């Protein structure tokens, strides 16, 4: 068993899982007659077959009892996942690297400011979302479509991870 | 001119138009052991060909005069496009049924509560995001593809419309 570091969410030390949904040192483009700046594509949504649908959700959840057991993770094979925060407020997030099972030695906690989404990419092993706050509101853009979508995978009593926040 | 009638957004009324995005009214299963309300499927994202990609982008648009003088709408002809808030802001919308050309005597106007997001249906005549604030953030996902997906169309003087909030 070990305890997670909580490092702040940044494009960079989280590429290995996915892309940081942010405007914070973002490209972007004028649109619009210059009335707007278009942050374009920070995030790709990837589905399994062109017939896939990608659809658009809002989940709203309750925070989790701390400190949180990490007990498993859960990946979709078949497409990618996107959470966004809607209420400005920060999250956490609890992830590990592609694979046929998630590595604890691997698994990482990352904590996003409030005005950071993220979207995880295919295969990506990751903890149902984490709140901050009591109850949070999250925009979702996942695939829609025929297979299996959702693996699950749990540790073994020293495998498991601790996620500690203050 | 016409002065077009700022009508609240709902979903009967705005159905003609592409959909809302909002937890209020809308159906929802729970998940994560019941921690998570998963209001599904508010939106699904539309493209024209199968290479096709739904893409995530982030839009921070800078406030229009008021009144405004709706001179023009776009369309996406290949893909549905989203506008989610993400600051809580309530906003403009401008809108047409779908047709060769948005028909001046059809526009509507619709105002979100700041925690609504709304789904241009592919084809649906839109104007450009109308902000109250004098700045806005909005995450928007649409289609990311080859050909043509951007028609505007401009009124002439005397099927132009005014936009008066105050
Ligand atoms: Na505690
Ligand atoms: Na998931
Ligand atoms: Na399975």
Redesign the interface.
Known sequence: MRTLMIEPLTKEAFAQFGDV???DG?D?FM??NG????????????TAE??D??????????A?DMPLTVRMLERHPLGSQ?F?????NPFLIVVAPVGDAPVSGLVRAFRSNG?Q?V?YHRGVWHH??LTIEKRD?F???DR?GSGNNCDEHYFTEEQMLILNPH
Do not use: C, Y
């Not at 278009?38 to 995030?43: G, Q």
């Not at 649908?53 to 309750?62: C, L, M, P, V």
């Open positions: 949904i942010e405007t973002s972007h649109i619009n009335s707007t700046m278009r942050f374009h594509k920070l995030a790709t949504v990837e062109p017939e649908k990608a659809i658009i959700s809002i989940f709203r959840a309750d989790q996107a966004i925060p809607l209420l400005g005005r989404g979207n149902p979302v509101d925009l979702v853009v829609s």
